[PDB]
RNA sequence: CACGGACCAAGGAGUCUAACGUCUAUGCGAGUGUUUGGGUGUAAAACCCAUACGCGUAGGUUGGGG
């Protein structure tokens, strides 16, 4: 999967675009495609990471930050790792969501602000997110590339949902400032993106 | 900047007393302390007497402040 383009704008298979009368694939057929989509995602994206590790100056300096840096520096480094290649670096996306969940209010707010900036940079579509089972033209003849893309869309929808969970728990925080900031982030997302608007 | 933080009001981790001794000030001085009692008293007082016992007593030369 190319990294130079936002992963929604990457051209899908043509078979996605003239398949509206396709028979409903059974759950096993959807499950196998969902699995095959998964293995292709944590496939070459690793090889992309292996290519990334070849640059020793780039890997070492960032690994030092990801290991020894402060929370703000780590949040930044993780945010960039997602901007450069959001599709490939599911590990950094998971890591970012993990900072949002800690007991530390200041850092969790910073991490969630970083996620909000990532979401509201156009990374999320103009349209809503689709689950893997709800993708159009879901077929056995779909290529690995498009299949990985659909799996990543399902994964990112789950990511947004767990981010909403983190918002909900934090939105009831006793501290007034935390509640106000969470409210501001919620209304920013609601105004500027369609995902989970309800 | 690095690290932590429901909210307001309060409250919030033990006592009197003894024995010996150094120094200083005051009174007296081989004395010193009374009050153990009494008198007296514009009355715990203040002023005064004894009454005992306690603790005390029982040269040579050189230098030498003066
Ligand atoms: Mg003599
Ligand atoms: Mg002489």
Instruction: Please tell me the distance from the alpha carbon of residue A152 to that of residue A53, in angstroms, as a whole number.
Output: 23
Q: What is the 3-state secondary structure (H, E, C) of A13-68?
A: CHHHCCCCCCCCCCHHHHHHHHHHHHHHHCCCHHHHHHHHHHCHHHHHHHHHHHHH
Q: Where are the alpha helices (DSSP H) in A27-175?
A: 27-41, 45-54, 56-68, 71-84, 90-100, 105-118, 144-171
Q: Is-contact A1 A149, C-beta < 8 A?
A: yes
Joined together, the tokens standing for residue A47 give 């090889």
Q: Is-contact A139 A25, C-beta < 8 A?
A: yes
Cβ count near A54 (within 10 Å): 9
Closest CA to A170 of A157, A159, A158, A184: A184
Instruction: Please tell me the distance from the alpha carbon of residue A190 to that of residue A168, in angstroms, as a whole number.
Output: 14
Joined together, the tokens standing for residue A105 give 């209010």
The secondary structure element, H or E, covering residue A178 is: helix A176-192
Instruction: Please tell me the distance from the alpha carbon of residue A47 to that of residue A60, in angstroms, as a whole number.
Output: 18
User: Which residues have CB under 8 Å from A59's CB, separation 6+?
Assistant: A52, A53
Instruction: Please tell me the distance from the alpha carbon of residue A1 to that of residue A146, in angstroms, as a whole number.
Output: 9
In terms of phi and psi (left: phi > 0; alpha: psi -120 to 50; beta: otherwise), the region of A137 is left
Instruction: Please tell me the distance from the alpha carbon of residue A116 to that of residue A72, in angstroms, as a whole number.
Output: 15
Instruction: Please tell me the distance from the alpha carbon of residue A99 to that of residue A43, in angstroms, as a whole number.
Output: 26
Instruction: Please tell me the distance from the alpha carbon of residue A24 to that of residue A130, in angstroms, as a whole number.
Output: 16
For the CA of A188 and the C1' of B61, the distance in angstroms is: 117
Q: What angle do CA A107, A108, A109 make, to 5 degrees?
A: 90
* Ligand 1 centroid to residue A165 C-alpha, Å: 110
Q: Strand B: which nucleotides have any atom within 7 A of a protein Cβ?
A: 1-7
Tell the residue number behind the tokens 């579509």, with chain if given: A125
For the CA of A128 and the C1' of B33, the distance in angstroms is: 111
For the CA of A12 and the C1' of B19, the distance in angstroms is: 104
Closest CA to A6 of A100, A83, A65: A83
Q: Is-contact A89 A82, C-beta < 8 A?
A: yes
Scanning every strand, the nucleotide with its C1' closest to A102's CA turns out to be B4
Residue A195: φ, ψ to 5°? -70, 125
Instruction: Please tell me the distance from the alpha carbon of residue A173 to that of residue A168, in angstroms, as a whole number.
Output: 9
* Ligand 1 centroid to residue A59 C-alpha, Å: 104
Q: What approach was used to elucidate this structure? A: cryo-EM
């Amino acid at each position: 999967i190319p990294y130079d383009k936002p992963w929604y704008e990457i051209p899908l298979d043509p078979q996605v675009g003239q398949n509206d009368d396709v028979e409903e694939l059974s759950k096993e057929q959807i499950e196998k495609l969902f699995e095959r989509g998964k293995q292709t995602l944590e496939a070459d994206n690793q090889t992309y990471y292996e290519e990334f590790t070849k640059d020793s100056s780039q890997a070492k300096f960032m690994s030092q930050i990801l290991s020894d840096g402060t929370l703000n520096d780590k949040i930044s480094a993780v945010t960039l790792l997602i901007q450069d290649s959001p599709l490939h670096n599911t590990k950094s996306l998971e890591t970012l969501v993990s900072y949002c969940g800690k007991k530390s209010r200041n850092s969790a707010l910073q991490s969630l602000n970083a996620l909000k900036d990532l979401f509201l940079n156009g990374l999320l579509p103009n349209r809503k997110l689709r689950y893997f089972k709800n993708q159009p033209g879901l077929s056995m003849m779909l290529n690995k590339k498009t299949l990985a893309i659909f799996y990543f869309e399902d994964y990112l929808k789950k990511l947004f949902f767990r981010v909403l969970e983190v918002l909900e728990v934090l939105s009831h925080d006793p501290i007034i400032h935390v509640r106000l900031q969470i409210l501001n982030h919620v209304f920013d997302l609601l105004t500027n993106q369609p995902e989970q608007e309800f």
